[PDB]
Write a protein that binds this ligand. Structure first.
Ligand SMILES: CC(=O)SCCNC(=O)CCNC(=O)[C@H](O)C(C)(C)COP(=O)(O)OP(=O)(O)OC[C@H]1O[C@@H](n2cnc3c(N)ncnc32)[C@H](O)[C@@H]1OP(=O)(O)O
Ligand SMILES: CC(=O)SCCNC(=O)CCNC(=O)[C@H](O)C(C)(C)COP(=O)(O)OP(=O)(O)OC[C@H]1O[C@@H](n2cnc3c(N)ncnc32)[C@H](O)[C@@H]1OP(=O)(O)O
Ligand SMILES: CC(=O)SCCNC(=O)CCNC(=O)[C@H](O)C(C)(C)COP(=O)(O)OP(=O)(O)OC[C@H]1O[C@@H](n2cnc3c(N)ncnc32)[C@H](O)[C@@H]1OP(=O)(O)O
Lengths: 275, 275, 275
C-alpha cells in the first residue's frame, strides 16, 4: 500500500454531510467519514446514503471510511460502498480481533484496511492482525481500550496502560513492515497546549500522526510534527561530522556512532532536502 | 465464581488467631488467613491448628486462606483444611508458575483459587494461569516480584517494572474473563497519604482493590475507591446529554462518543443507582 | 558461564589499538574491543589485524570482542579470531534476531555469547535468544533500538519504549537463568551527573551494570552501583530484627515479611560480608 506518513486523520460522521467538505479543507492528510460509533443505529442507513451522495457529487474527493464491523447487519452494505466508489481509498476496521476479520474486509472492499486496536482481544491477536494481508497501518481506539480495560481516561495510570498497547502497535508496525501508525484521539478539542503535548509524545515514540476529531486540531498537529530548527541544526551538524567518514565521534558532548548518524540522516531527508 | 469487586483483602497470620476476629470486624471485603510467608517454618503446624480451631469455633465466618505452595511439605495439609471447612471460601495460591498448579489446588480444595503472581515464571505463564479452571481473580505479589527480579523496592525504576507486570495481570484478567484483580500490599502501615495514592493509581489502571496488611488501611482504601462527587457529577451530565441518543456531543470541552458514554453509565451504575 | 556481575563493559574500537591498554587500565570489569559499528567498512580487515596483534602481544589480556553479524562478509573471520586467542573470553553478537544466530556464534567461536538486543525483531524473539545454548548474559543496544523504532533518543516517550525493551531483557534473564544483564550506553561523556542517574535507574531495575564508551565513565558507574550507607544500614536493621526468627515485624514503619528479609540479606551479602 501507501507507506507514507499520515500526520492527521480527521473523523467526520456521515450524519454530517455538510461537514465532510469542511473536513477536507482542514488540510488533514486523511479524512475519515464514519458510519459506526458516531452514527446512531437508526441513522446508519441514511448516513450511508449521505456518504454515497457525497462521493458521487465529489469524484475528486478521496476519503477513508470507518465501517461497521462484521457483528453489525449493515457490514456488507458498508463494504459495498467502500468497494464501489474510487474516492474510498481505505477503510478503518473497528473492534478488530483477528487476521481473518482483516482479510474479509480487505477482499470484499478491494481496499486497504487500517485495523483499529480497541480491545484487550485485539492486542492479544495483534501479531496476526498486523501481519494480515491488506493492512496498511495501525491506529488505536484510546477511549475504547479505556472502556474495555476499565481505565479512568486521562489519568497517570491509564496512560501507563495505554503505553503498553502503544508499544505493541509500534512493535508490530516494524515487524510486519507497515506504514507509520497513528496514535488515538485527543478529545479536548480547544486545549491546543494539551494537544501539542500528546502529539509530541506520539512522534517521539515513533508514531507518524494522530487520529483527529476537529479541523482546529489539524494545524497544531502538523506544526508540532515538523522538526524544530534545533533538531534540524543538530542533524546537520551530526551529518557534517560523519562526512569525513569517521566511525565514531562527539557532537554535543555526546558520542555519535553509526546508529546516531543514521538518525540524523533520516531526519534530514524525511523532512527537507536529503543528501 | 464470584465476579464481584473485592476492594480490600486483609492479611492476618495464623500465628495470631486472636487477630482473626479483629481482621473481620475491620470491614475488609475479604480477610486472608496466612499459612505461608508470615508464619515462620517452626510455627506452621501449630498455625494451621490455630486456623482449624478458629473455623470450627466461628461457623458464620468466611475467610480466604493463603496456603504454602506445593514445594512445601505441608501443602497437602493446607489443602485439606481449605477443603474441609465451609468458612474457607477460596485460597490464595502463592508463587504460581503453571496452570497445572492452579488445577491441583482447585480440584483438591474444591474451592476457588486466587493465584498470586509473584515471579518472572508466573508472568511468563500468566495466559495459562489466568485461564485455568477454578480461577476467580488474580492478585499481585509486589514484594516477592521485587525479590525475584532484584528490584530496589520503592524506586522509580522498580515501579516501572512493576507496571509491566501489573499490565499482564490486567490484560489477562480481561482475556480470561476473571473478576477484578487486586494490586499488591502497601507496607507503610501509617502513611495514609501514600496508601491513598497507591489505591487511586491501582483503581485508575483497572484494579478492583488492594491486598492490605493492617485493619487501619481498610477505610482509606474503601474511601479512595468510591467515585468522587465530581466523577459522579460528570457521569450524570454525560449520561444526561446522551439520553436522546445522539452519536457524538461535547461535555467538558471534550468529545463524548459511544465508548465515553459507556464509561459514564458503568460508573453511575457500578457505584450507585443505575439507569 | 560466569554468573557474576559485570559492572562495566568499556567499548574501544579495533582501529585504535593504542587505546585498548588504556581501556584495561580503566578498571572496567570488562573491556569490549569492537569490530562492528565503530569500525568503518574500509578499516575492518586492518582493525581485525590490529586486534590479533594486540592479543598475541598481550597474552595476559582478557577482552570481549564485538563481531560483525552473520550478514557481514567478515563474520567467519571475526569468529575465527575469537576462537583462536585465549584472550577473547566472549563475544558481543549485535543485531541478534534468532536463537540460531546465537548457536552459530557460540558453536563457531566456542566462547560465551552476549547477545545485544538492538531491534524490534530481536525483542520479539527474545525468549528464544536468551534460552539459546551459549548465552552468558544479555545487553541492550539503546541507540540501535531508537533507530529501528524511530525513537527520539533522550525524550520522555522514547525512554518509556526503551523501558519495555529493558523489561523483556530483565524478564528473559530470570526465565533463562542468565548472568545479570547490562543497560545500554550513556553517550554524554562528561555529564557524570546524568551518567550517575542512568546508572542508578538501571540498578534499581535489576541490571548489574552498564555498557560504557569512555574510561572516565568507569568510576562513576562503580561508585553508583555500590549500596549507600543508608541502604546497608537499612538491611542491617531489618536483618537484625529478623534474627530471632519472627515471621512478620515492623522496621521503618514498614511491614517486613519473608520477601523483604531476603532483600535485606541479599544486599548485605552481594555487597559486603554475608551471614
Ligand atoms: C473514537 C473517536 O474519537 S472518532 C469516532 C467519532 N468521531 C467523530 O466523528 C467526532 C468528530 N467531531 C465532531 O463530530 C464534532 O467536532 C463534535 C460533534 C465532537 C463537536 O462539534 P461542535 O461542538 O458542534 O462544533 P463547534 O461548535 O466546535 O464548531 C465546529 C465547526 O467546525 C466544523 N466541524 C466540527 N467538527 C468537524 C469535523 N469532524 N469535520 C469537519 N468539520 C467539522 C463545523 O461544521 C463548524 O463549522 P461552521 O462554524 O462553519 O459550521
Ligand atoms: C502482604 C504480605 O506480606 S502477606 C502478610 C501476611 N501476614 C501479615 O503480615 C498480616 C498483616 N500484618 C500483620 O500481621 C501486622 O499488621 C504486623 C505484624 C505487620 C504489625 O503488627 P503490630 O505492629 O504489632 O500492630 P499494631 O500495634 O499497629 O496493631 C494495632 C491493633 O491492630 C491489630 N492488628 C494488627 N495487625 C492486624 C491484622 N493483620 N489483623 C487484625 N488486627 C490486626 C492489633 O491486634 C491491634 O489491636 P489491639 O490494639 O486491640 O491489640
Ligand atoms: C553501537 C555502538 O557503536 S556503541 C559505541 C561503540 N564504541 C565506541 O563508541 C568506542 C568507544 N569510544 C571512543 O572511541 C571514544 O571514547 C570517543 C571516540 C567517543 C571519544 O574519543 P576522544 O574524543 O578522542 O577522547 P578524549 O578527547 O576524551 O580523550 C580520550 C582519552 O582517553 C582515552 N580513551 C578514549 N576513549 C577510550 C576508550 N574507549 N578506551 C580506552 N581509552 C580511551 C584516549 O586514549 C585518551 O587518553 P590520552 O589522552 O592519554 O590519549
Amino acid at each position: 500500500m501507501n507507506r507514507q506518513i499520515v500526520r492527521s486523520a480527521l473523523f467526520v460522521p456521515a450524519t454530517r454531510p455538510e461537514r465532510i467538505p469542511k473536513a477536507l479543507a482542514s488540510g488533514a492528510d486523511r479524512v475519515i467519514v464514519d458510519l459506526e460509533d458516531a452514527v446512531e443505529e437508526g441513522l446508519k442507513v441514511e448516513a450511508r446514503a449521505n456518504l454515497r451522495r457525497f462521493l458521487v457529487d465529489t469524484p475528486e474527493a478521496r476519503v477513508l471510511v470507518r465501517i461497521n464491523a462484521a457483528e453489525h447487519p449493515g457490514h456488507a452494505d458498508d463494504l459495498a460502498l467502500c468497494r464501489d466508489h474510487a474516492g474510498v481509498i481505505g477503510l478503518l476496521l473497528p473492534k478488530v480481533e483477528s487476521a481473518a476479520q482483516v482479510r474479509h474486509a480487505a477482499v470484499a472492499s478491494g481496499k486497504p484496511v487500517w485495523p483499529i486496536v480497541e480491545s484487550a482481544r485485539g492486542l492479544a491477536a495483534l501479531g496476526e492482525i498486523a501481519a494480515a494481508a491488506g493492512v496498511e497501518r495501525l491506529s488505536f481506539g484510546s477511549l475504547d481500550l479505556a472502556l474495555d480495560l476499565d481505565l479512568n481516561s486521562g489519568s497517570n495510570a491509564a496512560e501507563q496502560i495505554l503505553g503498553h498497547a502503544r508499544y505493541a502497535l509500534l512493535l508490530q508496525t516494524r515487524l510486519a513492515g507497515l506504514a507509520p501508525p497513528l496514535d488515538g484521539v485527543y478529545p479536548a478539542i480547544q486545549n491546543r497546549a494539551g494537544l501539542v503535548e500528546a502529539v509530541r509524545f506520539a512522534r517521539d515514540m515513533g508514531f507518524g500522526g494522530l487520529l483527529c476529531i476537529h479541523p482546529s486540531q489539524v494545524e497544531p498537529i502538523h506544526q508540532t510534527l515538523m522538526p524544530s530548527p534545533a533538531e534540524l541544526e543538530w542533524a546537520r551538524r551530526v551529518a557534517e561530522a560523519g562526512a569525513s567518514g569517521a566511525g565514531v565521534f562527539v557532537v554535543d558532548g555526546e558520542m555519535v556512532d553509526a546508529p546516531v548518524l543514521g538518525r540524523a540522516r533520516r531526519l534530514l531527508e524525511r523532512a527537507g532536502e536529503g543528501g
